Amino acid sequence: MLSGLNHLTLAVSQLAPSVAFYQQLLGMTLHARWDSGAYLSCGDLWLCLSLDPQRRVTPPEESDYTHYAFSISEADFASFAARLEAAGVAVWKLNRSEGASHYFLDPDGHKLELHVGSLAQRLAACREQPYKGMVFF
Amino acid sequence: MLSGLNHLTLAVSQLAPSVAFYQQLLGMTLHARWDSGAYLSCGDLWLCLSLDPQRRVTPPEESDYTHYAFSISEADFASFAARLEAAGVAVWKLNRSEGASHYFLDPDGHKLELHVGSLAQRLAACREQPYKGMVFF
Numbered sequence: 001m002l003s004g005l006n007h008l009t010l011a012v013s014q015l016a017p018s019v020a021f022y023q024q025l026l027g028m029t030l031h032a033r034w035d036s037g038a039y040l041s042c043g044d045l046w047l048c049l050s051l052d053p054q055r056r057v058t059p060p061e062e063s064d065y066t067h068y069a070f071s072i073s074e075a076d077f078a079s080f081a082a083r084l085e086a087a088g089v090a091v092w093k094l095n096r097s098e099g100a101s102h103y104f105l106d107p108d109g110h111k112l113e114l115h116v117g118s119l120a121q122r123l124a125a126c127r128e129q130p131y132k133g134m135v136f137f
Numbered sequence: 138m139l140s141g142l143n144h145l146t147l148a149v150s151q152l153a154p155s156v157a158f159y160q161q162l163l164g165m166t167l168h169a170r171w172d173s174g175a176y177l178s179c180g181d182l183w184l185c186l187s188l189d190p191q192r193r194v195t196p197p198e199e200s201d202y203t204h205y206a207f208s209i210s211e212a213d214f215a216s217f218a219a220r221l222e223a224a225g226v227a228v229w230k231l232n233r234s235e236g237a238s239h240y241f242l243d244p245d246g247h248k249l250e251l252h253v254g255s256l257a258q259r260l261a262a263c264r265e266q267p268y269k270g271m272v273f274f
């Protein structure tokens with residue numbers, strides 16, 4: 001039986017700017033680095049950056065909707081978004097759903113998100129206003 | 138600050154087979170589906186499957202090393218991996234370069250992994266068998 005997400009691994013084209021982005025800009029804790037990768041944590045999340053020459057710096061119009069959302073409190077959301085904006089981090093989508101969300105790109109074009117709110121909160125909102133064809137289990 | 142992974146969203150080309158893969162084959166909990174997506178949980182992980190006409194079924198030699206690992210206990214690991222193998226689930230990696238792991242593909246070629254062990258355990262193992270150039274902070 002699977003008990004949760006063990007780790008998220010992102011392929012990166014250049015290790016140093018990716019470490020700077022996740023550790024310094026996004027505030028994650030750097031635990032180890034080697035010639036071809038790094039391990040960071042963000043709360044319970046174990047993040048691995050893996051140096052991969054096959055990683056392309058990918059414009060957001062050229063990748064699908066797969067994305068990684070990090071939790072932040074409502075109280076901290078606006079100042080963190082402003083930090084990303086000051087750093088010139090590109091946005092790939094505007095928020096149109098429930099709960100605050102900021103959609104931003106990493107140096108290689110990985111699609112990231114800041115989101116406020118849990119699955120339970122989303123399901124409660126959906127019960128009141130179900131999406132087209134929505135069924136609950 | 139950021140406190141962990143709020144959710145993982147995977148773009149999928151065909152919703153029903155992807156829901157079946159994560160719910161029936163991997164045992165995740167299905168909470169809701171709709172015409173264009175589904176919400177599942179795996180322990181504390183919120184997984185969203187999002188129907189995306191841009192998603193392509195991607196062979197593993199065409200994608201980079203970005204991947205998603207799910208936690209499983211030492212007692213359950215081998216029989217779960219063997220069940221996926223017997224079910225014909227495609228693979229993408231054989232060499233255990235990061236501990237006890239089984240590497241497999243979802244229907245769209247998303248790179249998945251079963252892994253036994255925490256970040257702390259991986260750091261302790263790496264102190265004895267470090268990756269080239271490894272430094273610990």
Ligand SMILES: COc1cccc(C(=O)N2CCCC2)c1
Nearest residue numbers: 133134135136153169170171172
């Ligand atoms: C909305 O929940 C479900 C569950 C199982 C299947 C489906 C679905 O796509 N169908 C069922 C009738 C034909 C199309 C939806």
Ligand SMILES: [Mn+2]
Nearest residue numbers: 067069113146
């Ligand atoms: Mn999202």
Ligand SMILES: [Mn+2]
Nearest residue numbers: 009206235250
């Ligand atoms: Mn892994």
